[PDB]
Amino acid sequence: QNNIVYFDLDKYDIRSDFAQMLDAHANFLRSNPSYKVTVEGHADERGTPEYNISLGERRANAVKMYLQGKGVSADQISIVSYGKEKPAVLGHDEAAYSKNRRAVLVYL
Template identity: 70%
Template sequence: MQFSKFLKVAAVTLPLIAVTACTSTGSKKVVGNVSLPNDIQAQIQKLQQINTVYFDYDRYNVKSEYSTLLNSHAVFLRATSNLKVTIEGHADERGTPEYNIALGERRAAAVKSYLQANGVSGEQLSIVSFGKEKPAVLGHNEAAYAKNRRAVITYDGF
């Protein structure tokens, strides 16, 4: 299981490093005022497949098992400083709405801090909390709760 996760992250990270070292003359997509080559768009799509950090109940510390995932995003964001991301914080349904909004914000802030500690500019990062309002999985059991305690990195404009 861990090896499979490593292979997925490596499959994203290695081409990412190659892309940041090269330029493209292919067609481009405009995001905000920035025109992006197709290869950058492809890397964003790959990173969007590994964009979720899960948390323990009532916790907001980033576990070490997510360092490879977050490092992949950090490498890419450092190389493409014109891109911005929003980090969405989420909570499971337990607790008051106010508490869950605050917890989701702390989770998003923890991911933002990790990325900043790894060289990403704070200007590229924004956070938002949805608390329990946008569950990834519906259900009233621990398996559903575990999938809803998360922070999600979304690339603005994608």
């Protein structure tokens, strides 16, 4: 809930509902320039694995750009796309897919 941005099929933009959530992250990172965030991006299963890396990367990147828009240091933000290799849940309909189309902000 506080560290995940969700996306519709073939969409990669940060939509308004996540703005607030992301700002807390920017606030935090601006304050602790010691800190590094890893944006893990994902795609649902439709597609093929090496191509769907890119759908994950567009999502993670978009989080990165937004945070940089909030004053965060480029060097506090790395991105790792898992494509469709690490689903949050199994299943073959939109309930499963919307759950898996996401970018997760994690502090490693």
